Design a protein around this motif. Structure first.
Motif, short mmCIF file in Angstrom:
data_model
loop_
_atom_site.label_atom_id
_atom_site.label_comp_id
_atom_site.label_asym_id
_atom_site.label_seq_id
_atom_site.Cartn_x
_atom_site.Cartn_y
_atom_site.Cartn_z
N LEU A 105 0.82 -1.22 0.00
CA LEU A 105 0.00 0.00 0.00
C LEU A 105 0.86 1.27 0.00
O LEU A 105 1.64 1.49 0.92
N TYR A 106 0.70 2.11 -1.02
CA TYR A 106 1.62 3.23 -1.20
C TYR A 106 1.54 4.22 -0.04
O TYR A 106 2.52 4.91 0.27
N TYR A 107 0.38 4.28 0.61
CA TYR A 107 0.13 5.27 1.64
C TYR A 107 0.95 5.07 2.91
O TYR A 107 1.29 6.04 3.59
N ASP A 108 1.26 3.82 3.25
CA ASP A 108 1.89 3.52 4.53
C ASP A 108 3.43 3.49 4.39
O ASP A 108 4.01 2.42 4.17
N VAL A 109 4.06 4.66 4.53
CA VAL A 109 5.51 4.80 4.30
C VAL A 109 6.36 4.78 5.57
O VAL A 109 7.59 4.63 5.50
N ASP A 110 5.72 4.92 6.73
CA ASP A 110 6.43 4.97 8.01
C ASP A 110 7.43 3.83 8.27
O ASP A 110 8.48 4.06 8.88
N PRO A 111 7.11 2.60 7.83
CA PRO A 111 8.05 1.52 8.15
C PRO A 111 9.33 1.51 7.29
O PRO A 111 10.18 0.64 7.52
N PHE A 112 9.46 2.42 6.34
CA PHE A 112 10.57 2.35 5.38
C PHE A 112 11.57 3.50 5.46
O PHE A 112 11.22 4.63 5.80
N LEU A 113 12.82 3.17 5.14
CA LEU A 113 13.82 4.16 4.77
C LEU A 113 13.92 4.12 3.26
O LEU A 113 13.82 3.05 2.65
N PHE A 114 14.08 5.28 2.64
CA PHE A 114 14.26 5.35 1.20
C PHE A 114 15.65 5.91 0.88
O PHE A 114 16.05 6.95 1.42
N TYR A 115 16.39 5.20 0.04
CA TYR A 115 17.71 5.66 -0.39
C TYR A 115 17.63 6.06 -1.84
O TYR A 115 17.55 5.22 -2.74
N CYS A 116 17.62 7.37 -2.06
CA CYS A 116 17.35 7.93 -3.37
C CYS A 116 18.61 8.44 -4.04
O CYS A 116 19.35 9.26 -3.46
N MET A 117 18.86 7.98 -5.26
CA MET A 117 20.09 8.32 -5.95
C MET A 117 19.84 9.37 -7.01
O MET A 117 18.90 9.24 -7.81
N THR A 118 20.67 10.41 -7.02
CA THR A 118 20.56 11.47 -8.02
C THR A 118 21.84 11.57 -8.84
O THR A 118 22.92 11.27 -8.36
N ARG A 119 21.69 11.97 -10.09
CA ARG A 119 22.83 12.39 -10.90
C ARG A 119 22.93 13.90 -10.81
O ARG A 119 21.92 14.59 -10.85
N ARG A 120 24.15 14.40 -10.68
CA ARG A 120 24.37 15.84 -10.67
C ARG A 120 25.16 16.24 -11.90
O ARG A 120 26.14 15.58 -12.28
N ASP A 121 24.71 17.32 -12.53
CA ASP A 121 25.42 17.91 -13.65
C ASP A 121 25.17 19.42 -13.65
O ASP A 121 24.72 19.98 -12.64
#
Ligand code: COA
Length: 276
Positions: A105-121
């Motif tokens: 269920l997309y709504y329930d985010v509390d139990p997760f850590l998110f590691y988000c990767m970005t490219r920089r230019d």
């Protein structure tokens, strides 16, 4: 009168118009139009180009909302607590669901850590992918879901995400493995990563390595190591334990690997401590 009720058939994200692979439950009205706008910084969705532009001109940070725990000349990683950035992470999960057969269920985010990767230019940060991870996993999974946005797939980013996920496990002094079951795309990516990892170890570290040395060095589980070693035909017994060993095939694979000049994660640049 023909009243058309359309599916979401394209999401507009920056210059990209992407077709969903699967349905995602965006809480928006279905109409005769088949598109939504996704802000590439906030991940917010808009049924209207005008609404999207109105919010675009607001002053917002131009990267994901968390601590930057890794930064090299190529990518950054941001660690986001789902509970601390509920809206943004919910938006990220709706987007991710367009490219997954199933997702919790997309709504329930509390139990997760998110590691988000970005490219920089020259233009700043561009989110290219992420993996989520349960704050507390009963099965010790070190990744819950992993995703490279379709516009960036097959550029090597997925492998960087996987490599990073294992750098966290190593820092945790734990073995780990991705949550099962794994999509076909996910599993094939992991198999390639596991294979490249053993191949690289055999050339750059030691010609013969015990299963437990591998596990200590990589945070791969015994099972994933054994499966990979058997696929490569490099499982042997030497000095009283199971090892993997180097041969000409492995050496050739390594050289083909290096020839590709791919980017990797530098563990020395991960500035991070487990919650402890
Ligand atoms: C699984 C997933 C993250 C892989 O991401 P990705 O960034 O495309 O992975 P990579 O680019 O590292 O590698 C993928 C392929 O592209 C190739 N590739 C990478 N860089 C390349 C380049 N510069 N030129 C040509 N090919 C390249 C790789 O060799 C590999 O090819 P192969 O499968 O034929 O061996 C992606 O498929 C995805 O997000 N899928 C949907 C989400 C999903 O199913 N997740 C599972 C967990 S829930």
């Amino acid at each position: 009168e023909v009243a058309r009720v359309r599916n979401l058939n394209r999401i507009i994200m920056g210059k990209y118009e992407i077709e969903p692979w699967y349905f995602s439950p965006y809480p928006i009205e279905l109409t005769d139009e088949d598109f939504i706008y996704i802000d590439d910084f906030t991940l917010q969705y808009f049924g209207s180009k005008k609404q999207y532009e109105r919010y675009r001109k607001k002053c917002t940070l131009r990267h994901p909302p968390g601590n930057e725990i890794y930064r090299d000349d190529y990518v950054s990683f941001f660690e986001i607590d789902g509970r601390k950035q509920r809206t943004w992470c919910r938006n990220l999960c709706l987007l991710s669901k367009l490219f997954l057969d199933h997702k919790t269920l997309y709504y329930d985010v509390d139990p997760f850590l998110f590691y988000c990767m970005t490219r920089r230019d020259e233009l700043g940060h561009h989110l290219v992918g992420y993996f989520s991870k349960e704050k507390e996993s009963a099965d010790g999974y070190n990744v819950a879901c992993i995703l490279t946005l379709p516009q960036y797939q097959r550029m090597g980013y997925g492998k960087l995400l996987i490599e990073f996920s294992y750098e966290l496990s190593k820092k945790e002094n734990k073995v780990g493995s991705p949550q099962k079951p794994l999509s076909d795309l996910g599993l094939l990516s992991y198999r390639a990563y596991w294979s490249d990892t053993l191949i690289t170890l055999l050339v750059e570290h030691q010609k013969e390595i015990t299963i437990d040395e591998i596990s200590s060095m990589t945070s791969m589980t015994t099972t994933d190591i054994l499966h990979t070693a058997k696929t490569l035909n490099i499982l042997r017994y030497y000095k009283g334990q199971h090892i993997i060993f180097l041969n000409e095939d492995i050496l050739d694979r390594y050289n083909r690997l290096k020839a590709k000049k791919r980017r990797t994660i530098d563990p020395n640049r991960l500035i991070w401590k487990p919650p402890v």
